[PDB]
Symmetry: D2
Subunit: 116 residues, 4 copies
Protein backbone atom coordinates (compact mmCIF):
# COMPACT_ATOMS: atom_id res chain seq x y z
CA UNK A 1 0.00 0.00 0.00
CA UNK A 2 1.18 3.44 -0.99
CA UNK A 3 -0.18 5.10 2.16
CA UNK A 4 0.09 3.57 5.63
CA UNK A 5 -0.57 5.27 8.97
CA UNK A 6 0.46 3.66 12.29
CA UNK A 7 -0.94 5.19 15.51
CA UNK A 8 0.70 4.34 18.91
CA UNK A 9 -0.43 5.03 22.50
CA UNK A 10 2.55 6.28 24.51
CA UNK A 11 0.70 6.10 27.86
CA UNK A 12 -0.41 2.38 27.71
CA UNK A 13 2.50 1.10 25.44
CA UNK A 14 0.31 -0.42 22.73
CA UNK A 15 -1.18 0.34 19.29
CA UNK A 16 -4.17 2.73 19.36
CA UNK A 17 -7.19 0.52 18.43
CA UNK A 18 -10.25 2.10 16.80
CA UNK A 19 -8.75 5.60 16.14
CA UNK A 20 -10.62 7.23 13.22
CA UNK A 21 -8.39 8.31 10.31
CA UNK A 22 -9.69 10.49 7.51
CA UNK A 23 -7.61 11.34 4.41
CA UNK A 24 -8.54 14.36 2.20
CA UNK A 25 -7.05 15.78 -0.95
CA UNK A 26 -6.63 19.48 -1.71
CA UNK A 27 -8.90 19.74 -4.75
CA UNK A 28 -8.32 22.11 -7.62
CA UNK A 29 -10.31 24.92 -5.87
CA UNK A 30 -8.10 24.87 -2.69
CA UNK A 31 -11.01 22.77 -1.24
CA UNK A 32 -10.23 19.61 0.70
CA UNK A 33 -12.11 16.72 -0.86
CA UNK A 34 -12.68 13.56 1.13
CA UNK A 35 -10.28 10.89 -0.26
CA UNK A 36 -10.26 7.91 2.18
CA UNK A 37 -11.46 6.91 5.62
CA UNK A 38 -10.72 4.12 8.10
CA UNK A 39 -10.39 3.13 11.75
CA UNK A 40 -7.28 1.65 13.05
CA UNK A 41 -7.48 -2.08 14.09
CA UNK A 42 -5.35 -4.03 16.68
CA UNK A 43 -2.07 -3.35 14.86
CA UNK A 44 -2.62 0.31 14.99
CA UNK A 45 -3.15 0.68 11.16
CA UNK A 46 -6.48 1.53 9.35
CA UNK A 47 -6.68 -1.16 6.52
CA UNK A 48 -6.42 -0.32 2.80
CA UNK A 49 -6.68 3.48 2.74
CA UNK A 50 -5.90 3.79 -1.02
CA UNK A 51 -4.52 1.93 -3.93
CA UNK A 52 -1.56 2.87 -6.02
CA UNK A 53 -3.82 3.79 -9.03
CA UNK A 54 -5.89 6.32 -7.12
CA UNK A 55 -3.05 7.69 -5.02
CA UNK A 56 -2.18 10.37 -7.45
CA UNK A 57 0.10 13.34 -6.90
CA UNK A 58 -1.42 16.08 -4.75
CA UNK A 59 -1.48 17.62 -1.30
CA UNK A 60 -3.08 15.22 1.16
CA UNK A 61 -4.19 15.96 4.74
CA UNK A 62 -4.23 12.95 7.16
CA UNK A 63 -6.41 13.75 10.11
CA UNK A 64 -6.30 11.52 13.19
CA UNK A 65 -9.18 11.73 15.72
CA UNK A 66 -7.25 11.77 18.94
CA UNK A 67 -9.91 13.52 21.20
CA UNK A 68 -12.31 10.69 20.90
CA UNK A 69 -9.69 8.07 21.59
CA UNK A 70 -8.67 9.52 24.97
CA UNK A 71 -12.19 10.64 25.97
CA UNK A 72 -13.53 7.04 25.80
CA UNK A 73 -10.80 5.99 28.22
CA UNK A 74 -11.78 8.71 30.62
CA UNK A 75 -9.04 11.21 29.87
CA UNK A 76 -9.63 14.79 28.71
CA UNK A 77 -6.94 15.52 26.07
CA UNK A 78 -5.50 18.92 24.92
CA UNK A 79 -5.90 18.57 21.16
CA UNK A 80 -9.07 18.31 19.19
CA UNK A 81 -7.20 16.10 16.64
CA UNK A 82 -3.81 15.49 15.02
CA UNK A 83 -3.26 16.30 11.33
CA UNK A 84 -0.42 15.79 8.88
CA UNK A 85 -0.37 17.82 5.65
CA UNK A 86 2.02 16.69 2.94
CA UNK A 87 2.57 16.84 -0.89
CA UNK A 88 2.62 13.31 -2.26
CA UNK A 89 4.05 11.68 -5.28
CA UNK A 90 5.35 14.96 -6.68
CA UNK A 91 8.77 13.67 -7.79
CA UNK A 92 7.39 10.30 -8.79
CA UNK A 93 5.78 7.42 -7.01
CA UNK A 94 6.83 6.66 -3.40
CA UNK A 95 5.28 4.67 -0.51
CA UNK A 96 4.63 6.89 2.57
CA UNK A 97 4.21 5.48 6.18
CA UNK A 98 2.94 8.12 8.71
CA UNK A 99 3.56 7.18 12.37
CA UNK A 100 1.64 9.19 15.10
CA UNK A 101 2.52 8.58 18.75
CA UNK A 102 -0.09 9.76 21.24
CA UNK A 103 -0.22 11.18 24.83
CA UNK A 104 -3.00 13.31 26.30
CA UNK A 105 -0.82 16.40 25.89
CA UNK A 106 1.72 15.59 23.19
CA UNK A 107 1.89 13.90 19.80
CA UNK A 108 4.72 13.29 17.34
CA UNK A 109 4.46 12.38 13.61
CA UNK A 110 7.19 10.97 11.41
CA UNK A 111 7.13 10.01 7.69
CA UNK A 112 9.17 7.20 6.36
CA UNK A 113 9.20 7.58 2.56
CA UNK A 114 10.27 4.81 0.26
CA UNK A 115 10.81 4.19 -3.47
CA UNK A 116 8.46 1.29 -4.27
CA UNK B 1 1.25 36.06 28.23
CA UNK B 2 -1.66 33.60 28.21
CA UNK B 3 -0.41 31.98 24.98
CA UNK B 4 3.29 31.30 24.29
CA UNK B 5 4.66 29.13 21.47
CA UNK B 6 8.23 27.90 21.47
CA UNK B 7 9.65 26.37 18.21
CA UNK B 8 12.87 24.39 18.27
CA UNK B 9 15.19 22.92 15.62
CA UNK B 10 16.16 19.28 16.25
CA UNK B 11 18.83 19.12 13.38
CA UNK B 12 20.97 22.03 14.57
CA UNK B 13 20.04 22.16 18.30
CA UNK B 14 18.75 25.70 18.68
CA UNK B 15 15.44 27.64 18.66
CA UNK B 16 14.01 28.16 15.15
CA UNK B 17 14.37 31.84 14.45
CA UNK B 18 11.90 33.57 12.03
CA UNK B 19 9.26 30.78 11.75
CA UNK B 20 5.91 32.43 11.08
CA UNK B 21 3.20 31.44 13.50
CA UNK B 22 -0.48 32.27 12.96
CA UNK B 23 -3.30 31.77 15.52
CA UNK B 24 -6.98 31.48 14.29
CA UNK B 25 -10.17 31.22 16.33
CA UNK B 26 -13.07 29.10 15.17
CA UNK B 27 -15.76 31.62 14.51
CA UNK B 28 -19.48 31.18 15.33
CA UNK B 29 -20.00 29.82 11.85
CA UNK B 30 -17.35 26.98 11.92
CA UNK B 31 -15.13 29.66 10.19
CA UNK B 32 -11.50 30.02 11.20
CA UNK B 33 -10.92 33.71 12.06
CA UNK B 34 -7.40 35.10 12.07
CA UNK B 35 -6.73 36.11 15.63
CA UNK B 36 -2.90 36.63 16.08
CA UNK B 37 0.28 36.16 14.10
CA UNK B 38 4.05 36.70 14.64
CA UNK B 39 7.48 35.35 13.75
CA UNK B 40 9.80 33.34 16.08
CA UNK B 41 12.58 35.55 17.27
CA UNK B 42 16.08 34.51 18.43
CA UNK B 43 14.60 32.65 21.40
CA UNK B 44 12.27 30.46 19.36
CA UNK B 45 9.16 32.50 20.07
CA UNK B 46 6.74 35.05 18.61
CA UNK B 47 6.12 37.92 21.07
CA UNK B 48 2.84 39.30 22.31
CA UNK B 49 0.53 36.78 20.46
CA UNK B 50 -2.39 38.10 22.52
CA UNK B 51 -3.55 39.56 25.75
CA UNK B 52 -5.35 38.06 28.65
CA UNK B 53 -8.61 39.84 27.82
CA UNK B 54 -8.53 39.00 24.10
CA UNK B 55 -7.66 35.35 24.80
CA UNK B 56 -11.12 34.16 25.66
CA UNK B 57 -12.70 30.70 25.63
CA UNK B 58 -12.80 29.04 22.21
CA UNK B 59 -11.27 26.55 19.80
CA UNK B 60 -7.92 27.89 18.74
CA UNK B 61 -5.68 26.65 15.90
CA UNK B 62 -1.98 27.51 16.01
CA UNK B 63 -0.31 27.06 12.58
CA UNK B 64 3.44 26.92 12.39
CA UNK B 65 4.92 27.45 8.86
CA UNK B 66 7.33 24.63 8.68
CA UNK B 67 7.92 24.36 4.90
CA UNK B 68 9.30 27.86 4.60
CA UNK B 69 11.80 27.40 7.47
CA UNK B 70 13.36 24.16 5.94
CA UNK B 71 13.24 25.46 2.39
CA UNK B 72 15.26 28.65 3.25
CA UNK B 73 17.96 26.24 4.66
CA UNK B 74 18.16 24.19 1.49
CA UNK B 75 16.00 21.38 2.87
CA UNK B 76 12.89 20.03 1.18
CA UNK B 77 10.75 18.99 4.13
CA UNK B 78 7.80 16.56 4.33
CA UNK B 79 5.10 18.66 5.87
CA UNK B 80 3.34 21.67 4.48
CA UNK B 81 3.02 22.97 7.98
CA UNK B 82 2.39 22.11 11.53
CA UNK B 83 -0.85 22.96 13.37
CA UNK B 84 -2.11 22.55 16.89
CA UNK B 85 -5.92 22.73 17.43
CA UNK B 86 -7.14 23.05 21.06
CA UNK B 87 -10.16 24.43 23.05
CA UNK B 88 -8.82 27.21 25.32
CA UNK B 89 -9.95 28.59 28.63
CA UNK B 90 -12.87 26.30 28.78
CA UNK B 91 -12.63 25.53 32.43
CA UNK B 92 -11.45 28.99 33.41
CA UNK B 93 -8.34 30.96 32.42
CA UNK B 94 -5.01 29.23 32.20
CA UNK B 95 -1.63 29.89 30.59
CA UNK B 96 -0.74 27.62 27.69
CA UNK B 97 2.76 27.05 26.38
CA UNK B 98 2.90 25.15 23.05
CA UNK B 99 6.31 23.72 22.13
CA UNK B 100 7.02 22.55 18.49
CA UNK B 101 10.24 20.50 17.81
CA UNK B 102 11.13 20.33 14.11
CA UNK B 103 13.01 17.91 11.83
CA UNK B 104 12.52 17.69 8.06
CA UNK B 105 10.37 14.62 8.38
CA UNK B 106 8.96 14.70 11.94
CA UNK B 107 7.59 17.16 14.46
CA UNK B 108 6.30 16.87 18.03
CA UNK B 109 3.91 19.27 19.84
CA UNK B 110 3.60 19.41 23.65
CA UNK B 111 1.22 21.47 25.74
CA UNK B 112 2.03 22.75 29.29
CA UNK B 113 -1.16 24.23 30.82
CA UNK B 114 -0.87 26.42 33.87
CA UNK B 115 -3.51 27.15 37.01
CA UNK B 116 -6.40 29.66 36.48
CA UNK C 1 10.60 -12.56 18.16
CA UNK C 2 10.25 -11.52 21.77
CA UNK C 3 12.49 -8.45 21.37
CA UNK C 4 12.36 -6.13 18.36
CA UNK C 5 13.97 -2.70 18.02
CA UNK C 6 13.07 -0.34 15.14
CA UNK C 7 15.33 2.71 14.59
CA UNK C 8 14.07 5.65 12.41
CA UNK C 9 15.90 8.71 11.00
CA UNK C 10 13.72 11.79 11.52
CA UNK C 11 15.96 14.05 9.38
CA UNK C 12 15.99 11.93 6.13
CA UNK C 13 12.53 10.21 6.64
CA UNK C 14 13.77 6.63 6.38
CA UNK C 15 14.84 3.65 8.52
CA UNK C 16 18.34 3.99 10.05
CA UNK C 17 20.47 1.38 8.17
CA UNK C 18 23.55 -0.11 9.85
CA UNK C 19 22.95 1.32 13.39
CA UNK C 20 24.71 -0.91 15.96
CA UNK C 21 22.43 -2.29 18.69
CA UNK C 22 23.81 -4.03 21.75
CA UNK C 23 21.57 -5.71 24.36
CA UNK C 24 22.93 -6.46 27.90
CA UNK C 25 21.40 -8.09 30.93
CA UNK C 26 21.87 -6.93 34.52
CA UNK C 27 23.63 -10.00 35.91
CA UNK C 28 23.26 -11.21 39.47
CA UNK C 29 26.18 -8.98 40.65
CA UNK C 30 24.58 -5.71 39.35
CA UNK C 31 27.00 -6.22 36.38
CA UNK C 32 25.71 -5.80 32.84
CA UNK C 33 26.47 -8.94 30.89
CA UNK C 34 26.47 -8.85 27.11
CA UNK C 35 23.26 -10.59 25.93
CA UNK C 36 22.82 -9.88 22.16
CA UNK C 37 24.23 -7.73 19.39
CA UNK C 38 23.16 -6.70 15.89
CA UNK C 39 23.16 -3.96 13.25
CA UNK C 40 20.01 -2.70 11.83
CA UNK C 41 19.36 -3.56 8.11
CA UNK C 42 17.21 -1.68 5.48
CA UNK C 43 14.00 -2.03 7.49
CA UNK C 44 15.53 -0.40 10.44
CA UNK C 45 15.53 -3.63 12.61
CA UNK C 46 18.64 -5.67 13.72
CA UNK C 47 17.65 -9.35 12.84
CA UNK C 48 17.05 -12.06 15.47
CA UNK C 49 18.32 -10.46 18.68
CA UNK C 50 17.07 -13.29 20.97
CA UNK C 51 14.80 -16.24 21.07
CA UNK C 52 11.91 -16.78 23.40
CA UNK C 53 13.82 -19.53 25.34
CA UNK C 54 16.78 -17.31 26.20
CA UNK C 55 14.78 -14.14 26.75
CA UNK C 56 14.29 -14.75 30.38
CA UNK C 57 13.01 -12.32 32.98
CA UNK C 58 15.54 -9.65 33.98
CA UNK C 59 16.55 -6.04 33.54
CA UNK C 60 17.81 -5.48 30.01
CA UNK C 61 19.62 -2.41 28.66
CA UNK C 62 19.24 -1.73 24.88
CA UNK C 63 21.98 0.55 23.72
CA UNK C 64 21.77 2.18 20.28
CA UNK C 65 24.95 3.64 18.74
CA UNK C 66 23.64 6.92 17.45
CA UNK C 67 26.99 8.92 17.38
CA UNK C 68 28.46 6.73 14.75
CA UNK C 69 25.37 6.83 12.59
CA UNK C 70 25.33 10.63 12.27
CA UNK C 71 29.13 11.03 12.16
CA UNK C 72 29.40 8.89 8.98
CA UNK C 73 26.91 11.20 7.30
CA UNK C 74 28.95 14.22 8.24
CA UNK C 75 26.90 15.45 11.17
CA UNK C 76 28.25 15.94 14.71
CA UNK C 77 25.47 14.76 17.08
CA UNK C 78 24.84 15.72 20.77
CA UNK C 79 24.54 12.26 22.31
CA UNK C 80 27.17 9.62 22.58
CA UNK C 81 24.39 6.95 22.30
CA UNK C 82 20.75 6.21 23.13
CA UNK C 83 19.86 3.59 25.76
CA UNK C 84 16.65 2.05 27.01
CA UNK C 85 16.65 0.25 30.37
CA UNK C 86 13.64 -1.93 31.16
CA UNK C 87 12.55 -4.96 33.31
CA UNK C 88 11.34 -7.71 31.01
CA UNK C 89 9.07 -10.64 31.38
CA UNK C 90 8.50 -9.98 35.07
CA UNK C 91 4.73 -10.59 35.08
CA UNK C 92 4.97 -13.33 32.51
CA UNK C 93 6.00 -13.57 28.91
CA UNK C 94 5.37 -10.58 26.61
CA UNK C 95 6.76 -9.44 23.21
CA UNK C 96 8.46 -5.99 23.44
CA UNK C 97 9.05 -3.68 20.36
CA UNK C 98 11.36 -0.68 21.12
CA UNK C 99 11.09 2.17 18.57
CA UNK C 100 13.89 4.88 18.59
CA UNK C 101 13.47 7.94 16.37
CA UNK C 102 16.66 9.89 15.70
CA UNK C 103 17.72 13.54 15.08
CA UNK C 104 21.17 15.01 15.71
CA UNK C 105 19.87 16.66 18.88
CA UNK C 106 16.81 14.68 19.96
CA UNK C 107 15.66 11.08 20.26
CA UNK C 108 12.42 9.48 21.43
CA UNK C 109 11.84 5.83 22.50
CA UNK C 110 8.52 4.05 22.84
CA UNK C 111 7.73 0.45 23.90
CA UNK C 112 4.83 -1.41 22.51
CA UNK C 113 4.31 -4.45 24.75
CA UNK C 114 2.17 -7.38 23.73
CA UNK C 115 0.91 -10.69 25.17
CA UNK C 116 2.24 -13.31 22.74
CA UNK D 1 23.57 28.14 34.71
CA UNK D 2 25.67 26.22 32.18
CA UNK D 3 23.53 23.09 32.63
CA UNK D 4 19.73 23.19 32.98
CA UNK D 5 17.40 20.18 32.78
CA UNK D 6 13.67 20.58 32.29
CA UNK D 7 11.40 17.49 32.86
CA UNK D 8 7.82 17.51 31.66
CA UNK D 9 4.81 15.22 32.11
CA UNK D 10 3.00 14.36 28.86
CA UNK D 11 -0.03 12.57 30.60
CA UNK D 12 -1.09 15.49 32.80
CA UNK D 13 0.41 18.46 30.88
CA UNK D 14 2.65 20.04 33.49
CA UNK D 15 6.32 20.01 34.63
CA UNK D 16 7.26 16.90 36.62
CA UNK D 17 7.80 18.07 40.15
CA UNK D 18 10.23 16.14 42.45
CA UNK D 19 11.94 13.92 39.81
CA UNK D 20 15.47 13.19 41.03
CA UNK D 21 18.16 14.07 38.53
CA UNK D 22 21.79 12.99 38.93
CA UNK D 23 24.74 14.18 36.77
CA UNK D 24 27.96 12.01 36.56
CA UNK D 25 31.25 12.77 34.82
CA UNK D 26 33.24 10.04 33.15
CA UNK D 27 36.37 9.90 35.20
CA UNK D 28 39.92 9.39 33.83
CA UNK D 29 39.50 5.68 34.35
CA UNK D 30 36.23 5.16 32.31
CA UNK D 31 34.57 5.51 35.81
CA UNK D 32 31.38 7.50 36.18
CA UNK D 33 31.95 10.07 38.97
CA UNK D 34 28.98 11.67 40.70
CA UNK D 35 29.18 15.32 39.86
CA UNK D 36 25.75 16.98 40.68
CA UNK D 37 22.29 15.93 41.78
CA UNK D 38 18.95 17.65 42.55
CA UNK D 39 15.18 17.21 42.40
CA UNK D 40 12.80 18.90 39.88
CA UNK D 41 10.95 21.67 41.59
CA UNK D 42 7.52 23.12 40.67
CA UNK D 43 8.89 24.39 37.36
CA UNK D 44 10.20 21.04 36.17
CA UNK D 45 13.81 21.73 37.05
CA UNK D 46 16.57 21.00 39.58
CA UNK D 47 18.32 24.23 40.68
CA UNK D 48 22.00 25.03 40.70
CA UNK D 49 23.23 21.68 39.13
CA UNK D 50 26.68 23.24 38.75
CA UNK D 51 28.68 26.34 38.18
CA UNK D 52 30.44 27.63 35.16
CA UNK D 53 33.89 26.86 36.58
CA UNK D 54 33.00 23.35 37.75
CA UNK D 55 31.31 22.51 34.44
CA UNK D 56 34.41 21.76 32.45
CA UNK D 57 34.97 19.74 29.28
CA UNK D 58 34.08 16.06 29.58
CA UNK D 59 31.57 13.29 28.93
CA UNK D 60 28.59 13.90 31.12
CA UNK D 61 25.68 11.53 31.85
CA UNK D 62 22.41 13.01 33.12
CA UNK D 63 20.17 10.35 34.73
CA UNK D 64 16.53 11.14 35.30
CA UNK D 65 14.71 8.78 37.76
CA UNK D 66 11.64 7.99 35.84
CA UNK D 67 10.41 4.82 37.61
CA UNK D 68 10.00 6.52 40.94
CA UNK D 69 7.95 9.43 39.50
CA UNK D 70 5.35 7.08 37.77
CA UNK D 71 5.26 4.62 40.65
CA UNK D 72 4.33 7.35 43.24
CA UNK D 73 1.34 8.18 40.91
CA UNK D 74 0.10 4.61 40.80
CA UNK D 75 1.61 3.92 37.37
CA UNK D 76 3.94 1.03 36.59
CA UNK D 77 6.15 2.48 33.89
CA UNK D 78 8.33 0.76 31.26
CA UNK D 79 11.71 2.29 31.84
CA UNK D 80 13.97 2.00 34.82
CA UNK D 81 15.17 5.49 34.10
CA UNK D 82 16.10 7.94 31.48
CA UNK D 83 19.69 9.00 30.76
CA UNK D 84 21.33 11.47 28.45
CA UNK D 85 25.09 10.98 27.72
CA UNK D 86 26.91 13.88 25.97
CA UNK D 87 30.46 15.38 25.66
CA UNK D 88 30.29 18.94 27.09
CA UNK D 89 32.26 22.07 26.41
CA UNK D 90 34.43 20.37 23.93
CA UNK D 91 34.58 23.18 21.47
CA UNK D 92 34.54 25.90 24.10
CA UNK D 93 31.96 26.80 26.76
CA UNK D 94 28.30 26.72 25.92
CA UNK D 95 25.01 26.56 27.82
CA UNK D 96 23.10 23.31 27.51
CA UNK D 97 19.41 22.88 28.24
CA UNK D 98 18.25 19.23 28.32
CA UNK D 99 14.48 18.71 28.11
CA UNK D 100 12.91 15.28 29.07
CA UNK D 101 9.19 14.64 28.18
CA UNK D 102 7.72 11.67 30.05
CA UNK D 103 4.93 9.14 29.44
CA UNK D 104 4.74 5.70 31.08
CA UNK D 105 6.00 4.00 27.97
CA UNK D 106 7.93 6.68 26.02
CA UNK D 107 10.29 9.57 26.62
CA UNK D 108 12.00 12.12 24.36
CA UNK D 109 15.20 14.10 25.11
CA UNK D 110 16.12 17.31 23.26
CA UNK D 111 19.27 19.39 23.58
CA UNK D 112 19.40 23.20 23.00
CA UNK D 113 23.07 24.31 22.98
CA UNK D 114 23.87 27.97 23.35
CA UNK D 115 27.07 30.26 21.97
CA UNK D 116 30.41 30.18 23.91
Amino acid sequence: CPLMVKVLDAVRGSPAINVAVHVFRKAADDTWEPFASGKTSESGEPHGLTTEEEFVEGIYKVEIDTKSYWKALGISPFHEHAEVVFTANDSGPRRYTIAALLSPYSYSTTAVVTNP
